[PDB]
Symmetry: D2
Subunit: 239 residues, 4 copies
């Protein structure tokens, strides 16, 4: 099975809770040395210490992905601690339903958060994945980059931009041996309203962050060695 | 024939040359009063004067769509000259192939020009279209919003963002009686041409009047129940 | 102003009611000579007579699109009265929610009715459009060729096949001067809190009239769409129903 | 780890050589009892006994998926041999460029081979996956179900129909605990025109059948337990033209 991450160094952003924490833990179990980062230093340090206790190699840092100070800090810290960069999980991001008439300061924020930060991070990491022989980029998107709904003028445009950025920079950094893929998570179990939302999920249950973690582990692994420019929706079969 | 634009006021950005100029002319022939705008005052004024000579109502303005001063100026000038806003054709834009290692500022410029400008323009124009009993917005995207290619890190992401912005803000301004659609133009007329036509099954390149008539359909009462759609005018292939 | 239908002969299949009748009538107003066909001859004859009453050129025929005898009859038919074929609207189709364990003959039926019929009709009509100088093929698909939902194992597959067949045979009959486009209609109008519930997902706050699909088709089969081919236009008011 | 298939029974169709052969050999390493089937008994028997020699559980039967004779035969043979059905890999397909003016006996072929077959197969397998507590159906499709090209009147329509049939019957058999996914492979390794097709493949190399085999293993494993109605393109990041 080429589903292990041995000799891998994986930078996981927004990885103190939820999908990022699960991705970091599962990647570490797979043999990858994990640079856990978050907007909060305390959560990232906690997750990294938990990983080290489990028997893995990890460090914990504070990173605001929108701050190039912090981005170069994370890149340099990964290089100092582990010597190379081979996996970049851009899970950091946010945004939500904003009105059509929103202040433009919110529209620009949605793209500086969900898109600009991760593109700059991929720019920063791609050269180090090149003398490393190749790497894997994984941007964690959302199901709003494909679906059309109200109040999604900022979030949805940003997530679809993430998707097509994946599909396109698959072509630029391919020669570097780098694979760009994305994961679109659905409803994650971090109640008649819950069952009403399950009525459109054919598998009859909500997803666990382990689902996203395993999809990511596949996409970042040598098993996905000839997979690039792909958005994989983990939704149980619906919206 | 509900393919006329009588009692219509159409703002057309980047309309001194090419697709925008042909859209302005075709919309004026359809009976619409056209606020031609451009980054260069002289071209917009020339196109507007030619339209007025041909027998239509038009004005010409300088507008950097990235400048909110210019945007409010165009909105107020349209409301002064013609009393209402019913059609907004965001043809203004640009960018192109930039390297993956491009300076970020390039990546922010691609979106401020190709996305943020037209979203702020739609924001400014939506209340007046609602007041005027509804209207139509048409974003002039590019085929890079769908295709995947090299050097398209910023252009492709911005264009797919325009596509999904169209699809989604069709839902917000729908209740206002506003339809949002987008045109993706192929290769435009203005042995690699033979590769172009190896791809284009119709064996010829497209004239700006093709995009003009597609826009005229999408901004006319004949498309009164069409919104959230991206029409690709490529002759049936990719160039 | 290329939205006029002069010197055109359109074959509109399933043109007795709804989208088909609206398409036949609006094409005839545009100046096209309309071969109205339907599964029944009385409905097609009623629509054709009504178009001739409006002041258009129209004939009415019985056609089961799955019967090649009927297909050849319709081609020869229009061909004998008008002399040419320049437009082909494949609106004739059917099917709906069938279970996953459906009898496989039902599954073959979905494709024979919604796909094999219109592909054979396009095959027959391409030489004459070619011969004419140019032509237009418009396949009336469904929003189920794109959307994913229960009980659509046969209908959704067939309509997605229609969509991609459009996109690809746009490459084949391109050199003939023929354009292949598709229309995906939304919810059509023909104290309804379920109707308002389905309107909650339609941003324009109303249901679409058959005239909307009629005008969209008219555009796509018009000289104004002269450089448009291989495209599926969804007329849904901006949502899903 | 959930990248296994212990306590699994797999019906792979089209596995004398290529993607199906790799899928049968790789699913068996995951511990799955594999029912290797194909058009010729010789190749399916050969592959099946090779999975046996390595240490897996397998058999090799004749199956022409357009023949309901063989269709029920493989269902009842997998139950005879292993007792349950939990995984169904529909790789058996084929076809290619045909003229626009083709007969109905080429178009109908393409659809009875690429689509009707795997649908009847999924129909047959679904009640046993329901009986066995859920399972995975995996249709092998094509990049022509997304991309447009000349002569693709029958191949492209059929594979796009496969894509959408996946996306839709994900809703039908979901309640049964079944996940339906699809793989779209690129150019498979089995030259300078090769470098010309590689100029559109960013990873600068062609794909091996093990790539599709491992994407399939992921898509039919417990690690993809909440993934359904998806089409995964294994293409190296681009399209390859032959």
């Amino acid at each position: 099975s080429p589903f292990h991450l041995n000799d891998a160094v994986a930078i996981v952003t927004g990885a103190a809770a939820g999908i990022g924490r699960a991705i970091a833990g599962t990647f570490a179990k797979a043999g990858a040395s994990v640079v856990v980062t978050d907007l909060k230093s305390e959560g990232a340090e906690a997750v990294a210490a938990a990983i080290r206790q489990a028997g893995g190699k990890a460090i914990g840092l504070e990173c605001n992905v929108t701050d190039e100070q912090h981005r170069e800090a994370v890149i340099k810290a990964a290089l100092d601690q582990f010597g190379k960069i081979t996996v970049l999980v851009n899970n950091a991001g946010g945004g939500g339903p904003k009105p059509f008439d929103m202040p433009m300061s919110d529209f620009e924020w949605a793209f500086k958060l969900n898109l600009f930060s991760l593109f700059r991070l991929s720019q920063l990491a791609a050269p180090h994945m090149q003398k490393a022989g190749g790497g894997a980029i994984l941007n964690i998107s959302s199901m709003a980059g494909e679906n059309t709904n109200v109040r999604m003028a900022s979030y949805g445009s940003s997530k679809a931009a993430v998707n097509h950025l994946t599909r396109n920079i698959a072509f630029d950094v391919g020669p570097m041996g780098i694979r760009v893929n994305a994961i679109a998570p659905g409803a994650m179990k971090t109640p008649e309203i819950e069952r009403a939302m399950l009525k459109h999920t054919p598998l009859g249950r909500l997803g666990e962050a382990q689902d996203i973690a395993n999809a990511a582990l596949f996409l970042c692994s040598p098993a996905a060695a000839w997979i690039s420019g792909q958005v994989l929706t983990v939704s149980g079969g619906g919206v």
